[PDB]
């Protein structure tokens, strides 16, 4: 049995020719990637931005080394590290990983994909794509006065050696991402969130054979997307993807929720609940933000109805979806474990009704 992350498994991965991600991804320039665009055409396929022009993406020169990270962040920090051959989580000092990295003669393949650096000297050196900041629920709807700490998941630094591999997952909470390769090369394997595929993914995720079964074989199309130095990949809600670090690589990235695919975001959250994913501890107060969002989304639909206007499709879909999930989390039987995410401001039962009544009309009123 070929085990994931092992050199044998890597020979096969490097051998398969996959349908090109050119079949589905949209290439565009910095300046085309706007809220306006995405509201009209949707954000349902990865968007590749070959040049970083007009993204608002500010980051270190292409020479920024693993050693420079160690400085700005602090070698003392204890970071998560993947033993790729074992597909398990390890810990070590940033200082050591840099030693391990800096030396050829790597006795094993070790990846760093989760090193969030907002609260460090290094943060000053990085500004995320304007588009991620424009869409992000944290940027738009997180009150300056809640008890829940603000999630910091916008600035990640990724260092990985050749043959680092991450297996097929859906990002925590169903968040979208951007990734930028500073040097080296990453290769994403991408799988559309059809229902066939999601379901198959939940199955595979809770099969004990998971690490012996390449989930790419289980779906009709698994798209290969090679992200080279200086390019910028944007992956939308729910997309199932694996990643291969084909060359020693440093990348930057960030995660964010937004209003476009609220339904898929919820589906993904409720699925990660079912699977008990530790990933979900990176966005602990997903539910809280959802409440804050339903407030704002309600207000917008109230303004459109009070003036005879018709709301865009994605807003009706999303609101209906929020409504279903707030209602679920409030059921008397489930309510004991959701109640703590209920922000002090919002009024659970009231809000849910105001949503119910708004969603009637729109339906019938259309
Ligand atoms: C290849 O790296 C991973 C291996 C994983 C694994 N084995 N199991 C589980 N799942 C359930 C049990 C606990 N597990 C972590 C040991 N999650 C994993 C998530 C991983 O990063 C992929 C996700 C990175 C960020 C996603 N938003
Ligand atoms: O580059 C990697 O190995 C994985 C990137 C990614 O998909 C993640 O960390 O969530
Ligand atoms: Cl967000
Ligand atoms: Ni990912």
Q: What is the CATH number of the domain that holds 175?
A: 2.60.120.650
Give yes or no for residue 166 CB within 6 A of ligand 2. Answer: yes
**Are residues 119 and 106 part of one domain?**
yes
| Nearest ligand atom owner, CA of 179 | 2
Q: What is the CATH number of the domain that holds 300?
A: 1.20.58.1360
What is the DSSP code (8-state) at residue 352?
H
Number of domains present in the structure of the chain: 2
What's the domain range around 331? 286-366
Give yes or no for residue 19 CB within 6 A of ligand 1. Answer: no
Considering Cα of 280, then 281, then 284, then 289, what sign does the dihedral take? negative
Q: Are 192 and 170 in contact (CB under 8 A)?
A: no
How far apart are the C-alpha atoms of 352 and 153, rounded to whole Å? 29
PDB experimental method: X-ray
**Are residues 296 and 259 part of one domain?**
no
Which residues on neighbouring strands pair with residue 277, listed in sequence order? none
Q: Are 59 and 230 in contact (CB under 8 A)?
A: no
- The tokens for 14 are 């490097």
How far apart are the C-alpha atoms of 233 and 238, rounded to whole Å? 15
**Are residues 359 and 244 part of one domain?**
no
For the beta carbon of residue 356, count every other beta carbon within 10 angstroms.
Answer: 12
CA of 104 to the centre of ligand 2 (A): 23
Instruction: Write down how long the chain is.
Output: 366
**Are residues 310 and 281 part of one domain?**
no
Residue 186 among known ligand-binding residues = yes
**Are residues 328 and 267 part of one domain?**
no
Which of 113, 178, 182, 244 to mutate to test ligand 2, by most ligand atoms within 8 A of the CB atom? 113
Q: Are 58 and 232 in contact (CB under 8 A)?
A: no
CA of 160 to the centre of ligand 2 (A): 10
Q: Among residues 238, 268, 285, which one ends one of the domains?
A: 285
Q: Among residues 219, 253, 285, which one ends one of the domains?
A: 285
Nearest ligand 2 atom to the CA of 179 is 5
CA 260 to chain centre: 14
**Are residues 276 and 308 part of one domain?**
no
**Are residues 150 and 14 part of one domain?**
yes
**Are residues 253 and 302 part of one domain?**
no
For the beta carbon of residue 353, count every other beta carbon within 10 angstroms.
Answer: 13
**Are residues 215 and 290 part of one domain?**
no
How far apart are the C-alpha atoms of 223 and 306, rounded to whole Å? 45
SS (H, E, C) 247-284: EEEEEEEEEECCCCCHHHHHHHHHHHHHCCCHHHHHCC
Whose CA is closest to 323, among 271, 236, 262?
262
CA 200 to chain centre: 20
**Are residues 317 and 268 part of one domain?**
no
**Are residues 122 and 60 part of one domain?**
yes
Which residue puts its alpha carbon closest to atom 9 of ligand 2? 113
**Are residues 224 and 136 part of one domain?**
yes
Considering Cα of 338, then 344, then 348, then 352, what sign does the dihedral take? negative
Resolution in units of Å: 2.7
Whose CA is closest to 260, among 321, 192, 327?
321
Q: Are 217 and 138 in contact (CB under 8 A)?
A: no
| Nearest ligand atom owner, CA of 188 | 2
Q: Among residues 229, 261, 285, which one ends one of the domains?
A: 285
Neighbours of ion ligand 3 (CB under 5 A): 136-138, 256-257
- Collapsing DSSP states into helix, strand and coil, what is residue 158? strand
């Amino acid at each position: 049995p070929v085990q994931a992350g092992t050199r044998t498994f890597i020979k096969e991965l490097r051998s398969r020719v996959f349908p090109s991600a050119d079949e589905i991804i949209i290439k565009m320039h910095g300046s085309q990637l706007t809220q306006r665009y995405l509201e009209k055409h949707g954000f349902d396929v990865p968007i590749m931005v070959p040049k970083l022009d007009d993204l608002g993406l500010r980051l270190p020169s292409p020479t920024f080394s693993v050693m420079d990270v160690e400085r700005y962040v602090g070698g003392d920090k204890v970071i998560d590290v993947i033993d790729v051959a074992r597909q398990a989580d390890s810990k070590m000092t940033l200082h050591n990983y840099v030693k391990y990295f800096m030396n050829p003669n790597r006795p094993k393949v070790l990846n760093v994909i989760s090193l969030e650096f907002s609260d460090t000297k290094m943060s000053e050196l990085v500004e995320v794509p304007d588009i991620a900041k424009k869409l992000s629920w944290v940027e738009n709807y997180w009150p300056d006065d809640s008890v829940f700490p603000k999630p910091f998941v916008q600035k990640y630094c990724l260092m990985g050696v050749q043959d680092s591999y991450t297996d097929f997952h859906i990002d925590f909470g169903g968040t979208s991402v951007w990734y930028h390769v500073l040097w080296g090369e990453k290769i994403f394997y991408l799988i559309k969130p059809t229902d066939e595929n999601l379901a198959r993914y939940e199955s595979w995720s809770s099969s004990v054979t998971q690490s012996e079964v390449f989930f790419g074989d289980k779906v009709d199309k698994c798209y290969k997307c090679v992200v080279k130095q200086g390019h910028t990949l944007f992956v939308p809600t729910g997309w199932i993807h694996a990643v291969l670090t084909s060359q020693d690589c440093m990348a930057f990235g960030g995660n964010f929720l937004h209003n476009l695919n609220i339904g898929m975001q919820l589906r993904c959250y409720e699925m990660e609940k079912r699977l008990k994913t530790p990933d979900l501890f990176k966005f602990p107060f997903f539910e809280a933000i959802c409440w804050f969002v339903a407030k704002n989304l309600l207000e917008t639909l109230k303004e459109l109805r009070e003036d005879g206007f018709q709301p865009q499709t994605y807003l009706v879909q999303g609101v209906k979806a929020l409504h279903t999930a707030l209602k679920l989390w409030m059921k008397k039987e489930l309510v004991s474990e959701h109640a703590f995410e209920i922000p002090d401001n919002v009024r659970p039962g009231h809000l849910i009704k105001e949503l119910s009544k708004v969603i009637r009309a729109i339906e019938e009123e259309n």
